[PDB]
């Protein structure tokens, strides 16, 4: 069983793929908190552009909301909703400057 | 439309997920080469363990083979086969030491 070339290329080319982002990233100065789960499944731009002078980056986007447990150690905890950025379309633009 | 908590948790917990790895990583001193595509789609261990003292890591593995274009700049180029490591099962083991 061998993955054929065009099939590899098509599957690895810059496109939106289910990715698992840490929430500390997506939410900046929320260190008065710990999250459960600590990460979340977001669609996000991935793979390569078959080139060193090209990077894969978001052109279209869309917000999704998620039930997260916002623990605040030594005080308390509650389930709240928490929106994250989700990439809907990708494009191989030129490396930043 | 709101992702329910247990559904987020189940989807983001340490498990094998289609990931897009650079080939320079998986193949070390092959810098007498450039690859097309430059990356490949491998199943790989991802998401979190809902904890700072725990990391997600491979326990079962399995090799997949792929048709890759091995360019060798200024000499030539040919399609060859190239095996990569693929994670079949994941587990939240304790952070290294």
């Amino acid at each position: 069983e061998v993955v054929k070339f065009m099939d590899v290329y098509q599957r690895s080319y810059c496109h939106p793929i289910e990715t698992l982002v840490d929430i500390f990233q997506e939410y900046p100065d929320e260190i008065e908190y710990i999250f459960k789960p600590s990460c979340v499944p977001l669609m996000r731009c991935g793979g390569c552009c078959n080139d060193e002078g090209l990077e894969c980056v978001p052109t279209e986007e869309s917000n999704i909301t998620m039930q997260i447990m916002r623990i605040k150690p030594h005080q308390g905890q509650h389930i709240g909703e928490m929106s994250f950025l989700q990439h809907n379309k990708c494009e191989c633009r030129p490396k930043k400057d | 439309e709101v992702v329910k908590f247990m559904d987020v948790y189940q989807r983001s917990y340490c498990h094998p997920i289609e990931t897009l790895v650079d080939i320079f990583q998986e193949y070390p001193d092959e810098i007498e080469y450039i690859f097309k595509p430059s990356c490949v789609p491998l199943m790989r261990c991802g998401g979190c363990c809902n904890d700072e003292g725990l990391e997600c890591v491979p326990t079962e593995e399995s090799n997949i083979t792929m048709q890759i274009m091995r360019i060798k700049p200024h000499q030539g180029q040919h399609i060859g086969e190239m095996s990569f490591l693929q994670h079949n099962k994941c587990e939240c083991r304790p952070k290294k030491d």
Epitope: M69, K72, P73, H78, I79 | -
Partner: antibody
Framework: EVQLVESGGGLVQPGGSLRLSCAAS????????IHWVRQAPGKGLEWVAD????????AYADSVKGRFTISADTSKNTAYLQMNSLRAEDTAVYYC?????????????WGQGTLVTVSS | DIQMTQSPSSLSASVGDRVTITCRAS??????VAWYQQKPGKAPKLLIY???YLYSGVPSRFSGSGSGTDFTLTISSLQPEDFATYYC?????????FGQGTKVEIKR
């Protein structure tokens, strides 16, 4: 202020059933993990069951599963331990608790407790 | 049972003594040790968690060590109201865990 208030303990012929109740107040049981922990006369602590509504996730101590079913009703902010098929060694002071990630899995509010006693 | 081995099972100590109950955990890392104080015919009251931290309103005379698997509740200046059964609990993966207990009493 938080408090847990249990009720429903009493006397039951062996092989019968009771319904213990754990009324909470001053916090959502939804957001936390609610436990039942019992104590036979003069002996120590034995965890029996627990519910975490947010996760939809329950659990049962080996000696008790099949017969007891823990449950919650978050509109009434009350948890419940329906016990069937009751035995002499089940006889105890049933305590209900609150566990959280905030206090690193520790059980920080317990109710006063009811006494279940299983005799003929 | 995710074991926990509490010792001593019971003890005496005159007022003001340095009393120290200890506990011995299962085979995992896992720092989720709590300590409770149970006065007779009464609900357990939480004292210390994650092994060192100290629930609100708990007196300064209680502390705890998280040192490998060897944990220690420690009452610097034992008091006439500290008579009770103290239970430890390793609670990281599950609650099926509770020390056997320690009836502390005053000597006088």
């Amino acid at each position: 202020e938080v408090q847990l208030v249990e009720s429903g303990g009493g006397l039951v012929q062996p092989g019968g059933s009771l319904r213990l109740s754990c009324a909470a107040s001053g916090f959502a049981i939804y957001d936390y993990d609610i436990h039942w922990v019992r104590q036979a006369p003069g002996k120590g602590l034995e965890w029996v069951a627990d519910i975490a509504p947010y996760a939809g996730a329950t659990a049962y101590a080996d000696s008790v599963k099949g017969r007891f079913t823990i449950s919650a009703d978050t509109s009434k902010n009350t948890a419940y331990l329906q016990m069937n098929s009751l035995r002499a060694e089940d006889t105890a002071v049933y305590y209900c608790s609150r566990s959280s990630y905030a206090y690193y899995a520790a059980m920080d509010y317990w109710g006063q407790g009811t006494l279940v006693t299983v005799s003929s | 049972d995710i074991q926990m081995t509490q010792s001593p099972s019971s003890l005496s100590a005159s007022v003001g003594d340095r009393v120290t109950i200890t506990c011995r955990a299962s085979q995992s890392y896992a720092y989720a040790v709590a300590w409770y104080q149970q006065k007779p015919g009464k609900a357990p009251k939480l004292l210390i968690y994650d092994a060192s931290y100290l629930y609100s309103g708990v007196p300064s005379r209680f502390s705890g060590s998280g040192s490998g698997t060897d944990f220690t509740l420690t009452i610097s200046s034992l008091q006439p109201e500290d008579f009770a059964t103290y239970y430890c609990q390793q609670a990281y993966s599950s609650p099926d865990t509770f020390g056997q207990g320690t009836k502390v009493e005053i000597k006088r």
